Amino acid sequence: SPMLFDVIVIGGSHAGQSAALQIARARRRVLVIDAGARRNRFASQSHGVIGQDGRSPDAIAADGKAQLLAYPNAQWREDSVVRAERSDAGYTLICASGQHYRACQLVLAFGVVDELPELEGLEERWGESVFHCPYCHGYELDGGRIGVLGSGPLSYLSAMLMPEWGQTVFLTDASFEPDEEQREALARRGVEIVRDRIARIVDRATVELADGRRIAFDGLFTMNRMRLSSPVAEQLGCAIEEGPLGPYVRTDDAMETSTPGVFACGDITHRGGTVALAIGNGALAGIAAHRKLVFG
Amino acid sequence: XXXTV
Numbered sequence: 663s664p665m666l667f668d669v670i671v672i673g674g675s676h677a678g679q680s681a682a683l684q685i686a687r688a689r690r691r692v693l694v695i696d697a698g699a700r701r702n703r704f705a706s707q708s709h710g711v712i713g714q715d716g717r718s719p720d721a722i723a724a725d726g727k728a729q730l731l732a733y734p735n736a737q738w739r740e741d742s743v744v745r746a747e748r749s750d751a752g753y754t755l756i757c758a759s760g761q762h763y764r765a766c767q768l769v770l771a772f773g774v775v776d777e778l779p780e781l782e783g784l785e786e787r788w789g790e791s792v793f794h795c796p797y798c799h800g801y802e803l804d805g806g807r808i809g810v811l812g813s814g815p816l817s818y819l820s821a822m823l824m825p826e827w828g829q830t831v832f833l834t835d836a837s838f839e840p841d842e843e844q845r846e847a848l849a850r851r852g853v854e855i856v857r858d859r860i861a862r863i864v865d866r867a868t869v870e871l872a873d874g875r876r877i878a879f880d881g882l883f884t885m886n887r888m889r890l891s892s893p894v895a896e897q898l899g900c901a902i903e904e905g906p907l908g909p910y911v912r913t914d915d916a917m918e919t920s921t922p923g924v925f926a927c928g929d930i931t932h933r934g935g936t937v938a939l940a941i942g943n944g945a946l947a948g949i950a951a952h953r954k955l956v957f958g
Numbered sequence: 959x960x961x962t963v
């Protein structure tokens with residue numbers, strides 16, 4: 663019964679669209695299956711993508727989808743892949759809707775999910791006054807006051823970086839004590855350290871400490887953990903590695919996973935993290951998937 | 959970028 667495609671792309675955001683476009687342009691049959699929840703759906707503007715700086719993320723996604731579907735040999739389903747299987751006839755995908763699809767090759771482009779720190783008030787401000795990436799949102803703080811919400815060893819790096827964008831306070835949240843050398847480095851960067859446990863976030867970006875003090879900020883940054891959006895990579899036996907902030911699907915320098923005929927791009931790979939990176943490694947994955955189609 | 963790059 664199930665429909666056959668040369669390639670199925672799982673995830674239809676920046677990475678998946680970029681990959682799908684290469685395959686479409688190679689005159690092969692490509693299907694995108696997308697569950698419609700992009701990582702960046704919380705901010706009203708996108709930055710750092712040359713040719714799209716300042717544009718709305720929904721508009722970026724919309725334009726990309728329209729220009730992919732301009733290729734008759736490209737198709738789209740609004741659905742969620744729940745199960746992936748490797749058979750002799752390639753790969754078989756089962757969706758939440760019940761639909762089955764088959765493909766010779768797969769591109770995984772399903773992104774990651776931010777696991778936010780358990781701090782009252784943080785979630786409702788995510789993408790408005792609380793962020794993850796200073797290259798994406800630092801500039802618009804206008805050199806103002808920036809709080810770095812500590813959550814273990816890696817937060818130190820964020821604190822060291824943040825003075826590029828404004829006056830920084832490293833809120834260690836009683837979780838990580840910088841060593842002697844670290845305190846000196848932070849001092850010479852002009853970073854103030856506040857060690858008190860955090861009670862909650864109020865106002866736009868004001869941190870209320872356990873002792874009742876309130877410190878107002880123009881923006882807050884968290885170096886939060888992230889998970890893979892989908893167990894599909896794991897179901898296909900792709901090697902998954904633990905990065906500094908969570909798991910990523912291992913790939914070679916052509917975006918192929920440890921499972922032949924399965925490629926990966928976007929945030930789920932080692933060097934993802936921004937839209938520009940997703941566009942680039944998505945394109946790479948698509949051309950590589952096509953090469954494997956042709957040459958085996 | 960997955961970190962400082």
Ligand SMILES: Cc1cc2nc3c(=O)[nH]c(=O)nc-3n(C[C@H](O)[C@H](O)[C@H](O)COP(=O)(O)OP(=O)(O)OC[C@H]3O[C@@H](n4cnc5c(N)ncnc54)[C@H](O)[C@@H]3O)c2cc1C
Nearest residue numbers: 673675676677697699701702709743773928929935936937
């Ligand atoms: C608040 C915020 C602001 C950001 N701002 C910027 C910015 O300004 N500039 C920038 O370059 N980057 C920004 N980023 C980073 C950026 O969002 C990512 O780098 C980028 O979206 C990753 O693209 P993707 O195609 O790899 O993942 P995603 O955009 O997260 O999309 C993955 C897609 O796959 C779908 N999917 C998931 N599971 C399944 C499944 N089982 N079956 C089918 N489909 C599935 C999802 O629904 C989703 O549509 C921001 C991130 C956040 C959180």
Ligand SMILES: [Cl-]
Nearest residue numbers: 793794795798
């Ligand atoms: Cl961000």
